[PDB]
Amino acid sequence: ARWFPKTLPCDVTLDVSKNHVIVDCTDKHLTEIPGGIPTNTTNLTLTINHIPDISPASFHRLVHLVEIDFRCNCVPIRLGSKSNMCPRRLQIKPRSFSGLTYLKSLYLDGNQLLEIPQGLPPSLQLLSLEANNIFSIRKEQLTELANIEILYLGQNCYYRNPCYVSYSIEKDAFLNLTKLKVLSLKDNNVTTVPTVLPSTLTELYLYNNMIAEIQEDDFNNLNQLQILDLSGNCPRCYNAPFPCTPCKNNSPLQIPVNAFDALTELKVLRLHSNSLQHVPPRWFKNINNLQELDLSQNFLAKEIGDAKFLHFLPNLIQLDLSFNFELQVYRASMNLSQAFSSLKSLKILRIRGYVFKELKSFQLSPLHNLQNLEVLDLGTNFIKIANLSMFKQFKRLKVIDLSVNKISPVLEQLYYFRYDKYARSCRSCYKYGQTLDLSKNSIFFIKSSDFQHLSFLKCLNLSGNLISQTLNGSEFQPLAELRYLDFSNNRLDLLHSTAFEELRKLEVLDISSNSHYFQSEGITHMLNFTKNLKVLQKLMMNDNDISSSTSRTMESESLRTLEFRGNHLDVLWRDGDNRYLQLFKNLLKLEELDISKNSLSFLPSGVFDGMPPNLKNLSLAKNGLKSFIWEKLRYLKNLETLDLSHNQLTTVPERLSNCSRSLKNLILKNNQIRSLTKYFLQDAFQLRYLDLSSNKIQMIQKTSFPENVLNNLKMLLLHHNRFLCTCDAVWFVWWVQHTEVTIPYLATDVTCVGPGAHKGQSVISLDLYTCEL
Amino acid sequence: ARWFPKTLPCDVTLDVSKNHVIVDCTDKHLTEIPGGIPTNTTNLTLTINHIPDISPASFHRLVHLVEIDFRCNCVPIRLGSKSNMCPRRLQIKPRSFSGLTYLKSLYLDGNQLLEIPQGLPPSLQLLSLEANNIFSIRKEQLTELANIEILYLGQNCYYRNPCYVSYSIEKDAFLNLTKLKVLSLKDNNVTTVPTVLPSTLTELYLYNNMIAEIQEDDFNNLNQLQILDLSGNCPRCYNAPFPCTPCKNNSPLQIPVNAFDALTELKVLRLHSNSLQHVPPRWFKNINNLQELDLSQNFLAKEIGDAKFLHFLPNLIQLDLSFNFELQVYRASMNLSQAFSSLKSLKILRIRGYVFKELKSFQLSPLHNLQNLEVLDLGTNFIKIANLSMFKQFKRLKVIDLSVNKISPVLEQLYYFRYDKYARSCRFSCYKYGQTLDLSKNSIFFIKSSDFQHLSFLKCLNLSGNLISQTLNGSEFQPLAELRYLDFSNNRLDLLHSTAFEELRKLEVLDISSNSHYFQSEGITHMLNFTKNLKVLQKLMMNDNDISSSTSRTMESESLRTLEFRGNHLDVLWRDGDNRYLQLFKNLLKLEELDISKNSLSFLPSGVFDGMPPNLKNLSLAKNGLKSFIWEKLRYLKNLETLDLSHNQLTTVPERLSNCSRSLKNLILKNNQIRSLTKYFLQDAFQLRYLDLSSNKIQMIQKTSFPENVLNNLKMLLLHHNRFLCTCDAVWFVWWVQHTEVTIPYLATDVTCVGPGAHKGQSVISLDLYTCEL
RNA sequence: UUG
RNA sequence: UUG
Ligand SMILES: *[C@@H]1O[C@H](CO)[C@@H](O[C@@H]2O[C@H](CO)[C@@H](O)[C@H](O)[C@H]2NC(C)=O)[C@H](O)[C@H]1NC(C)=O
Ligand SMILES: *[C@@H]1O[C@H](CO)[C@@H](O[C@@H]2O[C@H](CO)[C@@H](O)[C@H](O)[C@H]2NC(C)=O)[C@H](O)[C@H]1NC(C)=O
Ligand SMILES: *[C@@H]1O[C@H](CO)[C@@H](O[C@@H]2O[C@H](CO)[C@@H](O)[C@H](O)[C@H]2NC(C)=O)[C@H](O)[C@H]1NC(C)=O
Ligand SMILES: *[C@@H]1O[C@H](CO)[C@@H](O[C@@H]2O[C@H](CO)[C@@H](O)[C@H](O)[C@H]2NC(C)=O)[C@H](O)[C@H]1NC(C)=O
Ligand SMILES: CCCCc1nc2c(N)nc3ccccc3c2n1Cc1ccc(CN)cc1
Ligand SMILES: CCCCc1nc2c(N)nc3ccccc3c2n1Cc1ccc(CN)cc1
Ligand SMILES: *[C@@H]1O[C@H](CO)[C@@H](O)[C@H](O)[C@H]1NC(C)=O
Ligand SMILES: *[C@@H]1O[C@H](CO)[C@@H](O)[C@H](O)[C@H]1NC(C)=O
Ligand SMILES: *[C@@H]1O[C@H](CO)[C@@H](O)[C@H](O)[C@H]1NC(C)=O
Ligand SMILES: *[C@@H]1O[C@H](CO)[C@@H](O)[C@H](O)[C@H]1NC(C)=O
Ligand SMILES: *[C@@H]1O[C@H](CO)[C@@H](O)[C@H](O)[C@H]1NC(C)=O
Ligand SMILES: *[C@@H]1O[C@H](CO)[C@@H](O)[C@H](O)[C@H]1NC(C)=O
Ligand SMILES: *[C@@H]1O[C@H](CO)[C@@H](O)[C@H](O)[C@H]1NC(C)=O
Ligand SMILES: *[C@@H]1O[C@H](CO)[C@@H](O)[C@H](O)[C@H]1NC(C)=O
Ligand SMILES: *[C@@H]1O[C@H](CO)[C@@H](O)[C@H](O)[C@H]1NC(C)=O
Ligand SMILES: *[C@@H]1O[C@H](CO)[C@@H](O)[C@H](O)[C@H]1NC(C)=O
Ligand SMILES: *[C@@H]1O[C@H](CO)[C@@H](O)[C@H](O)[C@H]1NC(C)=O
């Protein structure tokens, strides 16, 4: 179907609308720029390779390159792989870029460069040099960058990539860059705000440096500035998970009261981890546009109960005061100044790490009339006592976050404590409505009154509490509109089949990782509790170690998805015991069933007949299946996806069309298949996806793989097999080289293991002409 | 060093004292009895193979055979592998055994036999026919067994191996087996006690059958009987995890009051799952020797509060009354009859599954003066309330088990609900510290010192798997002055205070594994230097805590010898560039054993080995995804004896292991990616004793890598499951493997050529390389 | 392989 | 692969 096989080890893509030819060679173990890159190439990406140098030969004929991404071909030692350390810094020979007349973006990050590469074309808008060893900026080296708009220089001098001196920037180095909009000098051992900066700046990133003081006029001309990040100068170092040096004398980052006067356009101000003890209202006298203010990780515990500066912030959307607690202090309660009530525009308020024992309704009163308040985050506060009914006054919020507290009767898991949460790399129930997140607390017992006045709730997260209780349907009575209950990581005791039946609008129920009572013999479990839940769509009961059930069927008219992974259906379906072979049969509208990780080394006859009639996607992954009667797939008349990955199957069916006329997606990766049957895919016409990767296949012949089926395949995975590239393989090699069908990893892992001559050689590159002499 | 390589695929052992030549061919994928079995073979085992028949050729030369274990060469379908189903039942041709004049033991279990094999020699003492399809016993077929003493016929007709009829035994079938001592007819669809049985019986196993009634004279002559098991006739089927049919009308197994009158020798009586509602004292009128009585899984809840029969059992050692609760009943308390006080010899009392809300001191008063009482088991009772101080009257006990209850302010996990807990297979803890109070798997969320008032005698406390989500500050355990072992695993400990546990001043072992909760949230203070206070602490387990951060930078101990730190994130604590935690273990001065496997250590930052404490001898870095390893750094570990690097991603071994560690004795490199050894790998490694190179990708081994003065010290050398290339370049290695005394497991099974073509799949032990010397 |  |  192709006249000329593509042999280039890079994905090539055409976006003809913007006349972009995109050539992506990311992570192809390349030691040279491959020959044959299309001459019309616009975007060329060579990240994560081991190309030791650039030269005029590199892009010689690539004259229409608008973007070169050449990052991480020599990552600095501590940042890169220790099993493949780069031996010598990337070498850029003169004239490597002067010919690239159309070049708009050049990425050279993580190449251990010692200096700003010169000879760059005047068309260049974006230059990126992060994670090199460039720690002295001189005006002379920047003249070439007249038209530059975006310049990334950070991570060139910090604990993970040290330069062992202070960063140096010459007076007015950036001033004649008259179009420069974004300047990032983060994570760099900088000691003062460089001046003067061009007044065209929109974004200035100076965080994680050694700037001890702000001069009044450091930001005098920056009347177009919209984002300023000064975080991590004089860091608060308590429990820092990276090496952290505080400013001497317990000093804060000193900012004169008028320092921001010119920043009339400022939208985002980040002062995280500057050891601040006070927030002078004078800072904000001439910024009324401010929308986002990060004051997390300072020492503003007292200031939170005063906070006059808030009166100057009527347009603020986001306010973060997390982790301002005083060391060794466990406050009784939360003192929020009344000044908070003047935050007319506030949608998002975050005060984790305030650290206090009792949350009481009136302490939140300053928030009562903030009409736009969508998120209230009081997590990681070690709150012991909170009458949940106080949130009757917060029905308008989208998320009330009390996660990780000690209550009893989405941000990344490392977020407030990571060094650079915006660092670049070399390469949930909120949607249901009002969410009360109580996850990771100490709730041991629940009763209906605990949820008094909270009938508006759509999602309740009780995951990771200590609830060890037989629910009989009486515990959630107020939660009349609840659509989503996360009850995972508790110790539910399904003694009563009336559990959860009061949650009459419940659509999704997670009772995963409630294995405690299931792992002790002789205890009653009612798995038919689903019959009462008339609108239940999705039920998760993963990792419960279920090996026994008092009831023999689960029943639902509504349930479409059942996750039953990590249980012991091998015990329930012990050969000879027929009692549970229709456990799922009366889930009449069930479409998706996950019974991976159930130790099902075989499937007793009757399991398939016992499946409910509308099953579409069935996972049997990770079972150690050593055999499989493919013919029994005939019972699964609506089966579209069959996941058999990570098992021990050695054969495929003689005729897949004779096993299922509906099957579209067959995942057989990570098995032990050594050969295909003679007529495997014969007449399997709307088969569309076939994963045979990570098996031990040596040969594939045309009878097993007729082209009338292969041409309909959205994707066909064959990588990591044991292909023998002898003359018997002539059809398969020819087809792989000329096919339109998508086959991932042809450049990297579709390989001959022999015969000797061809060992380790890619099938895409293989020349079998000697077979036709 | 051997003139004749051993090529037989079976382990051979000589026990010269007992004149035994033991040949074990268990699980060798054999389709025929291997040739070359020693002619002096006494014990021959061929279990788990697929030898389709036996014939006079089978044991032709093996005339001194005392034991043949030929089990599971054709296991019944539901019992066997579903990937390798046996196609046809084992065929035994005539006179296959009649020549084995010394044959004392014959096992033919799991072969789908239809009949009792004939022609057996009269020397036979033990015949085993479990898991076949023999379900009709006729006196004629038993004449050959004149001298038989032990006869196993069970598991021939039950749900996993059905015969679809009742078991049949001809009247007096066994009577003329005048030496018969043990008779097992369990799991067989038997409907009556076969009679008459020979009076020589010592053990009678009739459990899991369909016997609804015992005739009064069923055991009339069994005056030597010591063990009688009638369990599982009229079973109690509630929550049974196997198919279970009760006797109609909820009837119990009916036993006449005089049924046991002849059993004056009875030591063990098992009436488990017989749906009993009463235990008539008349049963035990002439059994005064009884030591073990299992009455679990009946309906004896009422009877436990009356239990007059206990007055007839002064010699009883074990009494099991577990799982007698009435269905749907949650009693307020445990009513134990005063009759319990007459169990003067009782060592072990088990009453799980009574099901009651409140345990109070006086309810155990019938037990107070049982002087020999060692074990009191009240687990799986859903007890909600118990003043632990009541056990101050029980300091003589060895184990007090309140496991799996709901208390708040060693048996197999499947045991009482298992079908046949003594079922044979085809192939074949802190109690030692002193008084143990097991509170594991309860609902304890908060502990305070007074909870343990009056229990200073305790040596071990098991709090595993509670809900304790508390900052221990040294005040919670104050009465436990003699505690040697605290299992605090699977809780939510909050190590805010470095004074946690410091009140346990005699503590030798502390398990705080799987307390990951507070370690999983950023910015929380964790004091790992809490160890300084524990002056006699030997062993610390803190596995699977997900530790990725620590406020303190060193742990300190003068006493700690073993630290388990597996399943944490030392990769994060030792991030390249961060030096603060590189001496985390350095001041554990007496530490000899460190497990830091499963810590995602894909590389080791420089400074880790220098930072190890000076006496470390046993170090595990297993299961880290280690992709590289500077072997030279082992030089810092001057007392290292065992290095476990299994299940990693290493591709090379050091050029000279002796130049890396002068102390290393045990080097575990199994399950890595090693493709070749260095030229002089083991040169002068005089302290090497154990070397596991199995499950790698080695193609070739040359003599320079494996000097013979090092190999001769090796207690063991593992090489199986590599990718050995059996060309003429491999002549040294093939010759050496064939002629070496060194122990190398799996030469018959998994030391194999992958090529060249001709030799693919062949064992190197069997490989003939003469063409390389023409 | 810029966490 | 007798649980
Ligand atoms: C291909 O490269 C071009 C050139 O850098 C990328 O286009 C730029 O995208 C950013 C995104 O906002 C714009 O600000 C620039 O102005 C764009 N430049 C041009 C010339 O249009 C494009 O995103 C890249 N695409 C791919 C798939 O790599
Ligand atoms: C950041 O710059 C400081 C200089 O202010 C570096 O500190 C010097 O480091 C050298 C070598 O380690 C010492 O000999 C000097 O005494 C240090 N000077 C001072 C004033 O401390 C520091 O190492 C740099 N940090 C990084 C990560 O590059
Ligand atoms: C070898 O076979 C003999 C005979 O079958 C075994 O001897 C029996 O051992 C059991 C258990 O150890 C004793 O209780 C019996 O009294 C012995 N029976 C006879 C008839 O002597 C012996 O154990 C076997 N040894 C090995 C290593 O397989
Ligand atoms: C145990 O024996 C009973 C009866 O002795 C068998 O039950 C009969 O089974 C046949 C075939 O399945 C049925 O048609 C009869 O109705 C049953 N009879 C009675 C009285 O129940 C039973 O199959 C046997 N069990 C096993 C495991 O072999
Ligand atoms: C964001 C807080 C980091 C420090 C910290 N860690 C913990 C912890 N692991 N457990 C606690 C348990 C209860 C109260 C406070 C803390 C606490 N705290 C706060 C705290 C620590 C110590 C003290 C002195 N009692 C008061 C408050
Ligand atoms: C060995 C016990 C098997 C049956 C069982 N299962 C459970 C269970 N999952 N949770 C309980 C929780 C409290 C009390 C009893 C049970 C119980 N029980 C006993 C029981 C169940 C139900 C009732 C009536 N509420 C009384 C007693
Ligand atoms: C909690 O507050 C609600 C009103 O918001 C009140 O009805 C209820 O009684 C309170 N409960 C407790 C224990 O204070
Ligand atoms: C509930 O909270 C936990 C955090 O502990 C989170 O992992 C989970 O995704 C949440 N559930 C939903 C439905 O968002
Ligand atoms: C369910 O249990 C709750 C809590 O103990 C109790 O208030 C209620 O009476 C019970 N409901 C039913 C229907 O048994
Ligand atoms: C669940 O099934 C059990 C069968 O053991 C029965 O006792 C109970 O009534 C059933 N309940 C529901 C809600 O289906
Ligand atoms: C205990 O139960 C027995 C038998 O049911 C009865 O005779 C006795 O009076 C009961 N005693 C107590 C204290 O409950
Ligand atoms: C528990 O019993 C002991 C007597 O052994 C007594 O000292 C203590 O007060 C009791 N505690 C409670 C809570 O009943
Ligand atoms: C404590 O009990 C747990 C839970 O039953 C058990 O796994 C553990 O091995 C016990 N610990 C000791 C030291 O015996
Ligand atoms: C430790 O905590 C316990 C329980 O909260 C308390 O009784 C005691 O005063 C505390 N002791 C110290 C030394 O902090
Ligand atoms: C443990 O180390 C911390 C240092 O962060 C110190 O504050 C504390 O007092 C130490 N405690 C002990 C018992 O060494
Ligand atoms: C080394 O320690 C491991 C546990 O970490 C133990 O299993 C092994 O037997 C020990 N080896 C020696 C030789 O002491
Ligand atoms: C390693 O070998 C070299 C050369 O034999 C020797 O100089 C050096 O001292 C040795 N080091 C150790 C630790 O044995």
Nucleotide whose C1' lies closest to the alpha carbon of residue B572: C3
CA–CA separation, B483 vs B463, rounded Å?
Answer: 13
Q: Which atom, in ligand 16's list, is nearest to the CA of B690?
A: 13
Which protein residue's CA is at the shortest distance from atom 18 of ligand 4? B165
DSSP A270-287: E--SS--S---GGGGTT-
CA–CA separation, B536 vs B507, rounded Å?
Answer: 6
Give the range of the structural domain holding residue A722, as residue numbers without chain letter.
1-773
Inter-chain residue contact A519 with B443, CB threshold 8 Å: no
Q: Give yes or no for residue B403 CB within 6 A of ligand 13.
A: yes
Is the C-beta atom of B427 closer than 7 angstroms to strand D?
Answer: yes
Contact (CB, 8 A) for A37 and A64: no
Continuous segment of H or E residues that includes residue A572:
helix A569-572
Q: How many CA atoms lie within 13 A of B35 on its CB side?
A: 0
CA–CA separation, A616 vs A595, rounded Å?
Answer: 13
- Choose, out of B83, B158, B725, the residue to mutate when testing the contact with A (most A CBs < 10 Å): B83
The number of distinct structural domains making up chain B is 1
Q: How is residue B417 written in tokens?
A: 């609900």
Question: What is the identity of the amino acid at B675?
Answer: R
What CATH code is carried by the domain that includes residue A331?
A: 3.80.10.10
CA–CA separation, A191 vs A84, rounded Å?
Answer: 34
Q: How is residue A207 written in tokens?
A: 């965080």
Q: Are strands B126-128 and B105-107 parallel, antiparallel or unpaired?
A: parallel
Q: Are strands A538-540 and B666-668 parallel, antiparallel or unpaired?
A: unpaired
3-state secondary structure of B275: coil
CA–CA separation, B613 vs A624, rounded Å?
Answer: 42
The beta strands (E) that lie in A494-635 are given as 508-510, 538-540, 561-563, 592-594, 617-619
Number of C-beta neighbours around residue A29 at 10 A: 11
Q: How is residue A553 written in tokens?
A: 């069927």
Q: Give yes or no for residue B43 CB within 6 A of ligand 3.
A: yes
Resolution limit, Å: 2.6
**Which ligand is located closest to the Cα atom of residue A41?**
1
Q: How is residue A55 written in tokens?
A: 């030269």
Number of C-beta neighbours around residue A468 at 10 A: 21
SS (H, E, C) B491-521: CCCCCCCCCCCCCCCCCCEEECCCCCHHHHC
SS3 of chain B: helix, strand, coil, percent, to 5 = 15, 15, 70
> What CA dihedral angle connects A91, A93, A94 and A96, to 10 degrees?
-100
Q: Are strands A20-24 and A11-15 parallel, antiparallel or unpaired?
A: antiparallel
SS3 of chain A: helix, strand, coil, percent, to 5 = 10, 15, 75
- Of B204, B202, B232, nearest to B218 by C-alpha is B204
**Which ligand is located closest to the Cα atom of residue A359?**
7
Instruction: Tell the residue number behind the tokens 């074309």, with chain if given.
Output: A121
What totals of helices (H) and strands (E) does chain B contain, helices first?
4, 38
Contact (CB, 8 A) for A734 and A705: no
Radius of gyration of chain B (CA): 32
SS (H, E, C) B446-484: CCCHHHHCCCCCCCEEECCCCCCCCCCCCCCCCCCCCCC
3-state secondary structure of B142: helix
Tell whether B406 is in a known binding site. yes
DSSP B419-444: S-TTPPPS----GGGS-EEE--SS--
Q: How is residue B368 written in tokens?
A: 């107070």
Contact (CB, 8 A) for A608 and A639: no
SS (H, E, C) A707-763: HHHHCCCCEEECCCCCEECCHHHHHHHHHHHHCCCCCCCCCCCCEEEECHHHCCCEC
- Of B169, B176, B68, nearest to B124 by C-alpha is B68
Question: What is the identity of the amino acid at B519?
Answer: F
Q: What is the spatial distance, in angstroms and rounded to an integer, between the CA atom of A130 and the C1' atom of C1? A: 14
Question: What is the identity of the amino acid at B547?
Answer: I
Cα→Cα distances B164→A573, A722, B188, B191, B282, Å? 21, 49, 11, 13, 37
Q: How many CA atoms lie within 13 A of A92 on its CB side?
A: 19
B392-398 long-range contacts (CB < 8 A, ≥24 apart) are B392/B454, B392/B455, B392/B457, B393/B361, B393/B364, B393/B368, B394/B364, B394/B367, B395/B435, B395/B457, B396/B371, B397/B373, B397/B435, B398/B374, B398/B431, B398/B434, B398/B435, B398/B436
Continuous segment of H or E residues that includes residue B734:
helix B731-739
The beta strands (E) that lie in A492-591 are given as 508-510, 538-540, 561-563
CA–CA separation, B562 vs B178, rounded Å?
Answer: 58
Instruction: Tell the residue number behind the tokens 């950070």, with chain if given.
Output: A154
Q: What is the spatial distance, in angstroms and rounded to an integer, between the CA atom of B722 and the C1' atom of D1? A: 27
Contact (CB, 8 A) for A638 and A616: yes
Instruction: Tell the residue number behind the tokens 């296959």, with chain if given.
Output: B96
CA–CA separation, A470 vs A494, rounded Å?
Answer: 6
Asked if omega into B121 is within 30° of 0 (cis), the reply is: no
Is the C-beta atom of A50 closer than 7 angstroms to strand C?
Answer: yes
Q: Which of A299, A330, A350, A383 to mutate to test the pocket of ligand 5 (most atoms within 8 A of CB)?
A: A330
Tell whether B382 is in a known binding site. yes
Q: What is the phi-psi region of residue B72: left when phi exceeds 0, alpha when psi lies from -120 to 50, beta otherwise?
A: left
Instruction: List phi, psi (to 5°) of A727.
Output: -65, -15
Tell whether B398 is in a known binding site. no
3-state secondary structure of B525: coil
Instruction: List phi, psi (to 5°) of B219.
Output: -120, 30
- Of A299, A294, A340, nearest to A323 by C-alpha is A299
Asked if omega into A196 is within 30° of 0 (cis), the reply is: yes
CA–CA separation, B449 vs B447, rounded Å?
Answer: 7
Q: How many CB pairs under 8 A join A and B?
A: 126
Instruction: List phi, psi (to 5°) of B328.
Output: 70, 15
Which residues in chain A are closer than 8 Å to B441, comparing Cβ atoms? 516, 520
Q: What is the spatial distance, in angstroms and rounded to an integer, between the CA atom of B596 and the C1' atom of C3? A: 23
CA–CA separation, B631 vs B621, rounded Å?
Answer: 13
Nearest neighbour of A239 by CB, restricted to B380, B492, B551: B551
Q: How is residue B640 written in tokens?
A: 């290292």
Kindly tell me the sign of the dihedral angle through the C-alpha atoms of A446, A450, A456, A462: negative
Ligand 7 neighbours, Cβ below 6 Å, are A 387, 389-390, 392, 452-453
Q: How is residue B291 written in tokens?
A: 């030591």
- Determined by X-ray
3-state secondary structure of B243: coil
- Of A219, A220, A215, A249, nearest to A234 by C-alpha is A249
Which residues in chain A are closer than 8 Å to B445, comparing Cβ atoms? 408, 442, 444, 466
Q: Enter the DSSP assignment of B23.
A: E
Tell whether B692 is in a known binding site. no
